[PDB]
Target: Otopetrin-2
Amino acid sequence: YRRPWIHEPRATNFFVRLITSLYALILTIISLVVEVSPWLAETIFYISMYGVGILFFAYCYIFIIYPGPYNQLISVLRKYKWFIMQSQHNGEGAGTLYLRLGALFFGSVGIVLFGLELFLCIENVACKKVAIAKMIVAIVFTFIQMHFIFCNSKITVNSSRKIVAFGMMHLISVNLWTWFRFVLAKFGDVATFLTTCIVEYSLIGAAIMFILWKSIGQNNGAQLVFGIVDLSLFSIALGACIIGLWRMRHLQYRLHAHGEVIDEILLIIGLIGEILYCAVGIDVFITCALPAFVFVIRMIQVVVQAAFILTTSRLRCLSKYSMKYKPGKEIITFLLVSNVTLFVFHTFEGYNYIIYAVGPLLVFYRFHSSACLAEIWKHTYS
Amino acid sequence: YRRPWIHEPRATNFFVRLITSLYALILTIISLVVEVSPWLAETIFYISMYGVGILFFAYCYIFIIYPGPYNQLISVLRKYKWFIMQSQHNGEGAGTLYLRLGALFFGSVGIVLFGLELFLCIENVACKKVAIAKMIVAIVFTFIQMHFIFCNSKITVNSSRKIVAFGMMHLISVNLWTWFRFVLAKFGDVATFLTTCIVEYSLIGAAIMFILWKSIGQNNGAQLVFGIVDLSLFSIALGACIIGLWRMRHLQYRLHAHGEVIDEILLIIGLIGEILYCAVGIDVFITCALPAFVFVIRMIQVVVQAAFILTTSRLRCLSKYSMKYKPGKEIITFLLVSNVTLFVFHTFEGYNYIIYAVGPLLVFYRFHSSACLAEIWKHTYS
Model:
């Protein structure tokens, strides 16, 4: 108009968005060098990141989500005698019910891990309060974050919209940094299950916090039988995706996107992990045919399934026939069963640095695919 | 409405967007493993990627940009006797004049490199046609791509909009793969200048092709004095950015975004390279104070300058005073001079794998900053 940009809403919106995104980018890059490098520096950094996250959570809980006890005090002071925090809230969450339940489960399994090394610290004679404290803040932050994720609806990112911006970007940085803490190798089956769960939990938390941040300012013989069963499971899932797209071609495009960005981000992360894993396997089996044939089938299946999900998540049965025939349902249920089976099977069955780094990404891709298909089974066919 | 999604425009748009993006993601990931792994496999892959790129370019040139000679033929056949290609075109480019001139320069310096190893192949006795051919297709593809970039306006991505989608994604994959070919170390000053130029050219080409793809479907003592001079140049640029934002606070937010996405992408890539480089330098100078102090100043300067540019690129002098006082111009010119000086100075002056990989990113960040500031000097003050 003629006003300065410091007083133009959509000018101030981007500026805050850009500043918070730059802060998150710097802190995420720094967290990688400090956690992928060859101790107090880390310790104080560790405790600082969790402490700032917990402080932001307390600010949100005291002043935004539950302003009652703060509202009392102002009145209690108004008795021993403007600034009372309204209870504006919402029901729109930043994730699906299945995704948030998975977040609760993976965070619970991460707290089990953190408590395990907490016990192994106290009951040993080599570590220090330095260990206990940081593990306590890890447990506290993780539990608070599970509670916040599972209730990411009432949160009004738009009441304190510049600390919620800085806070959400800091939380994304904390989740990504926690993921980076576990992309490096330090019962072998139970150990790799604990790291995977906390990696998956960090990914879900980062996606949820990013979706919330985006809404700020908005006015809205084993190696034989197992390979055989992987090939069979991949092949039937690969065919079901191809058939399902053919059967579901008569549905209609959605008019309102509902949770399509978080699903896109998580599915692409899982798919990137899957494609690297398959490509690296093909490369190593070439530089050093059953497994190599399985890897090509696995890559084709994961790519076609990613396309199938990302498309059918926008398809709704709104035609008279589409509402009555529910075209493709049995496909969705079959694919969901196959994906859950693959996730479970790859968990109980558990050039080595990419394998460990992308290890949790495979099972996270399977879990996210299941969570999307359950959402598709419900939202498309209503 | 009630129509199938296979016949809904915005449903078919995303589906094609998703399929092409998945193809580019797969091919880019595969290109990394094949080019960052420890020969025909590469050779045939190399020639395939360039050949498909050249085939797409020929399709665009014959059928879209210059359909005249094809239009003749249909008529020439209509004489020796529906399907004549219209000449729809545009003037809206996918990049600024300075960015496209930089692309021409860096591509020219890349062709000089390719011709250098072409000559070193013919006039030697160790390589093969296998080398000549692939180097010839590299030169041909690079020159065609410079011509296409510098004239990325008349291109109607929306005439053959599903091959231009596949083609643009393939070109992005080719540019990213060429970049990946040079993130690995194989006069030392002239050798590192040639690799840097082709990396910068690949980055600019990838950004341009992505912007064009996005528009598909749219209805629109050395180590002492040098450190001292780097610190002085960083400090004055750091202060100028802080002052400039204060002086330019009275301008107005833009109403139409003009080339803000390509600038964002390239600036973030350069900034990510800069932040890693600075963080890794701080880490190594800590694990093994003048240089370390310079690294912190450099990081602060690059981050503040990234914010300054990304903000002032959306600020226009539209107020009577803003149009008359042109607030901040001398800041833009001073910052542009400093950035050009830094780019030139770091070229003639030229834990080792990140250094080489992010090497070209630093000077590309300096060049992109200069190109944006020249754009800012012009677009803001008109």
Observations:
- Chain A has 13 helices and two strands.
- Residues 5-214 of chain A form one domain.
